Amino acid sequence: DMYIERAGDITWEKDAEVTGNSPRLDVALDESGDFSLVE
Amino acid sequence: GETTDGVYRVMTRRLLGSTQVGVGVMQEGVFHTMWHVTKGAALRSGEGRLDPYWGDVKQDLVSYCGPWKLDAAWDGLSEVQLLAVPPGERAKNIQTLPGIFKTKDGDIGAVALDYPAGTSGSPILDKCGRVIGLYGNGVVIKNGSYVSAITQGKRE
Ligand SMILES: O=C(Nc1ccc2c(c1)CNC2)c1cc(F)c2[nH]ccc2c1
């Protein structure tokens, strides 16, 4: 049996830790909702 | 039980101790999460029960208590924040500029941040605080790292 617990408010925070890149990837989506890389 | 708007953890006691399987958004009395987190199963919120209302394995989404309410979309230009709620750790905003998943049916935004699979369902926000999608469904790159799509549902 799964349960839920509140973890916070949904707000944008100014001056948050900025990380991560912006890749452009060729993908396919199958009937099972699974993504795969196309090359 | 608790139906206040906000980000919530999805937990289970089926495994050893209490284990976090995912995250979800509570908005307008509707709990929104990814299908692979719950697999359409009923949820508990204290003494209350949350029954599924809508779901789709291909979109990998599911809503509880009512129809999907989140309709905001990535503008294709601006940075976004992932309000990551990782297992055993406090909720934390992480700003990034999304990339693009190019598909036969059009382009989707994509966030490239590394989090455990239990972080799935964590919302992605725009500068107004609006949920533009959920994190948890994407691809594994050459680096073994994960790149998730910005998955949004449809509001009717
Ligand atoms: O496996 C993941 N996600 C998923 C699982 C099962 C299914 C789907 C997506 C959609 N069809 C069924 C996942 C999610 C994450 F956030 C992650 N972070 C690192 C690795 C990883 C992996």
Q: Which residues contact A15 (CB under 8 A, 6 or more apart)?
A: none
The residues pairing with B32 across neighbouring beta strands, listed in sequence order, are B25, B63
Domains and CATH numbers, chain B: 6-64 (2.40.10.120), 80-149 (2.40.10.10)
- If you count DSSP H runs as helices and E runs as strands, how many of each does chain B have, helices first? 1, 15
Report the sign of the C-alpha dihedral through residues B6, B123, A13, A2, in that order.
Answer: positive
Q: How far apart are CA B37 and CA B20, in angstroms?
A: 10
Best probe of the B interface among A3, A17, A32, by most B CBs < 10 A, is A3
Compute the 3-state secondary structure of chain B and give helix, strand, coil in percent, each to the nearest 5.
5, 45, 50
Let me know: does B84 contact B91? Beta carbons within 8 Å. Answer: yes
Report CB contact under 8 Å: B8, A24.
Answer: no
DSSP string, B72-118: ----SSS-EEEEE--TTS--EEEEE--EEEEETTEEEEEEB----GG
Let me know: does B24 contact B63? Beta carbons within 8 Å. Answer: no
Q: How far apart are CA B52 and CA B35, in angstroms?
A: 10
Distances in Å between the alpha carbon of B140 and those of A23, A25, A30, B94, B137? 12, 11, 15, 20, 10
Residues of B annotated as part of the active site: 36, 60, 120
- Structure determination method: X-ray
Burial of residue A28, with CB atoms counted within 10 A of its CB: 0-12 exposed, 13-18 middle, 19 or more buried = middle
Q: How far apart are CA A28 and CA B149, in angstroms?
A: 12
CB pairs under 8 A between A and B: 155
